[PDB]
Ligand binder design. Structure first.
Ligand SMILES: NC(=O)c1ccc[n+]([C@@H]2O[C@H](COP(=O)([O-])OP(=O)(O)OC[C@H]3O[C@@H](n4cnc5c(N)ncnc54)[C@H](O)[C@@H]3O)[C@@H](O)[C@H]2O)c1
Ligand SMILES: NC(=O)c1ccc[n+]([C@@H]2O[C@H](COP(=O)([O-])OP(=O)(O)OC[C@H]3O[C@@H](n4cnc5c(N)ncnc54)[C@H](O)[C@@H]3O)[C@@H](O)[C@H]2O)c1
Ligand SMILES: N[C@@H](CCCC[NH3+])C(=O)O
Ligand SMILES: N[C@@H](CCCC[NH3+])C(=O)O
Lengths: 357, 347
């Protein structure tokens, strides 16, 4: 742990190479497996939920939030995801709405040991979480997926869920016609047929639904309370600003609701709409004991998804394992570790030339 | 767009090209101007920092410190306090990094060392406060704690006050005995002296210790020169203080960040209504300080992220001028913003 040590940086090209080498399906399966196992450890009391995430809300050019998401594994390392939600990014800047990075700090010394992209990782672990929850709460013969919001998360929602359920078709809606019209192309690699459908038809026909929209505060719901199939399972994934919800209260009030992180869901999930005592067991509890969801595949269920840093730490480990196996990334001395630990000015600039000019 | 990364080597090169005094002055100047802007209501204090307490190896904390300049950028310092680092690992107790994110898009635009930058802006803040609240003819500086921050407390204060000597103490004999050579570059003579003597002879003191919660105080509850000014710089865990209560309770106290001070500063010992005007208020109206040079004063320093934003800008200006640093594509920006898998080209 001496001063010599440096930070392992995985850039955009290294993350691409992991995907190419491992393959999209297998990478996602790995992340599903890792999350499943980690959530079960939480459910058994072996590990703790992450502290509540925090952020700085920004009103322009459309309201969004930039957040910090710490998770400590005592004695090992601290993970921090720094992540923005800026829902004008695609149309104004050609950038994703969700832009972030994930860092690892040594628990013992506090040294920054690794840093990587958070955009891909976030999309993957968020799809994976919906898959963990849906494998438990959706009918195992579910064939039709509904998606409300067909932006970036929708892509990994469909992908992840196609890996745990025998999906054959997706019925999809977005309030931006261009975004719903491009979804078939973005979704084609999954082999799942895509059709555009209005929310009322999605509600009526889907076996499982994911909502993942940039709906503004107080502008929900995004799925009307219009008649749904009895066994419907919904992943409510949209999460950013306090005040943002996507599901109608009438539906939520008659569902079995599992939150990823109950205290956080009550603040910024659909559980904003509910009292604490109406919540079913949390996702970690279901992972430790799937029968705590007994019977809930045949009745209305909702997985309230907010995202928490433990999920990022687990996904990051999957990337760092595959990247280490292929020798990827670079090492950069970012942090100053002075030769004399008590002398901040003990720096080492490049030596000066000796020869006469 | 890619992230501009300034590592230890680039930071060393800034110091070598600009020089230590000049770099410190720039930071003093930027902070003085920034704090005065806060004091006029043109800018605002950072939100309260947060952290994760760590019990081992000895109690420490790893913290996150955000600051937003709306429409411009967001700064985040991530910083550990791990006071076994020097002796166990040869690492500084304070280890961190500073990142900048575009406010509009969220994108990570710059990343740099936080170790040097922390020590500089922390010295600078004491200099800002001391120029206001110490006697202008102050000749004797006292330092309690002679580790990393002491070096920049001395340097910064030597630039703003006519200091002739530093009386110093550390509970680790090796740490006090090495201080004269770490300080030599400042031209201020160093003498090792016990806390009772430092308390009684200093014109200005900075306390900057890794004292544990429940340990200390680091000066005795004694009589002091009437005009004594103290910078209380140690700050880490909730619970941690350095000064005796009887000294604090008869001082005029200014905090860098009053809410933060009340939680993790000397002001943890005081009720909220005993804090006086904050540092930014004095910076915008130096006349409010001028009567308090001749009676006991304390600057309660915790550090806040605005200071890190300002110091980082100084470094980025100097680095751009010499085109230092590298560019790394860290964040994935997919060719289609709505397609996370659009990673093309595959390697
Ligand atoms: N739960 C988690 O772990 C997690 C993680 C990542 C992102 N998120 C959240 O998922 C949501 C979507 O993120 P993204 O990366 O897909 O954003 P995106 O901008 O790529 O896609 C969101 C889409 O929602 C559409 N939309 C807005 N209002 C709508 C409405 N009323 N009905 C239908 N569609 C609507 C937009 O037109 C856009 O296509 C955000 O709230 C984001 O913060 C959650
Ligand atoms: N802005 C701020 O106010 C700010 C910024 C950086 C660091 N700090 C804080 O300043 C303190 C010191 O940081 P550092 O980087 O110099 O750490 P360091 O470990 O380099 O030096 C601390 C020194 O304090 C000494 N010490 C411990 N207990 C003492 C006692 N009772 N009396 C005298 N000396 C004692 C130690 O032996 C050590 O040499 C920490 O609390 C740190 O978190 C505050
Ligand atoms: N400003 C709020 C945001 C909470 C997180 C919202 N997803 C906070 O820091 O507490
Ligand atoms: N655990 C506390 C620590 C505050 C920072 C102390 N200097 C928090 O997150 O609020």
């Amino acid at each position: 742990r001496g001063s010599h040590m440096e930070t392992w940086v995985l850039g955009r090209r290294d993350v691409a190479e992991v995907v190419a080498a491992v393959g999209r399906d297998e990478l996602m399966r790995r992340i599903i497996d890792r999350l499943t196992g980690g959530l079960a450890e939480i459910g058994r009391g072996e590990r703790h939920l992450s502290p509540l995430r925090g952020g700085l809300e920004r009103s322009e050019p459309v309201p969004g939030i930039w957040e910090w998401m710490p998770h400590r594994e005592p004695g090992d390392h601290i993970t921090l995801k720094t992540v923005g939600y800026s829902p004008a990014n695609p149309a104004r800047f050609g950038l994703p709405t969700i832009l972030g990075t994930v860092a690892r700090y040594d628990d013992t010394t506090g040294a920054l040991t690794a840093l990587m992209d958070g955009v891909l990782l976030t999309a993957l672990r968020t799809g994976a979480a919906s898959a963990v929850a849906s494998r438990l709460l959706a009918r195992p013969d579910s064939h039709t997926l509904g998606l409300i919001g067909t932006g970036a998360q929708a892509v990994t929602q469909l992908h992840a869920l196609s890996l745990v359920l025998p999906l054959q078709r997706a019925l999809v809606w977005d309030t931006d016609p261009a975004h719903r019209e491009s979804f078939a192309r973005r979704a084609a690699f999954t082999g799942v047929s895509v059709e555009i459908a209005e929310p009322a038809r999605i509600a009526a026909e889907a076996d499982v639904i994911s909502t993942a929209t940039s709906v503004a505060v107080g502008q929900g719901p995004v799925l009307p309370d219009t008649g749904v199939r009895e066994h419907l399972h919904i992943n409510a994934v949209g999460a950013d600003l306090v005040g943002k919800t996507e599901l109608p209260l009438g539906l939520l009030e008659r569902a079995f609701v599992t939150a990823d992180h109950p205290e956080q869901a009550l603040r910024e999930g659909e559980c904003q709409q509910l009292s604490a005592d109406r919540l079913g067991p949390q996702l970690a509890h279901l992972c430790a004991d799937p029968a705590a969801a007994a019977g809930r595949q045949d009745t209305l269920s909702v997985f309230d998804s907010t995202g928490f840093a433990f999920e990022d730490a687990l996904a990051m480990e999957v990337f760092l394992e595959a990247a280490a196996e292929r020798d990827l990334g670079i090492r950069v001395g970012i942090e100053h570790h002075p030769g004399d630990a008590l002398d901040p000015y003990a720096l080492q600039p490049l030596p000066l030339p000796l020869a006469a000019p």
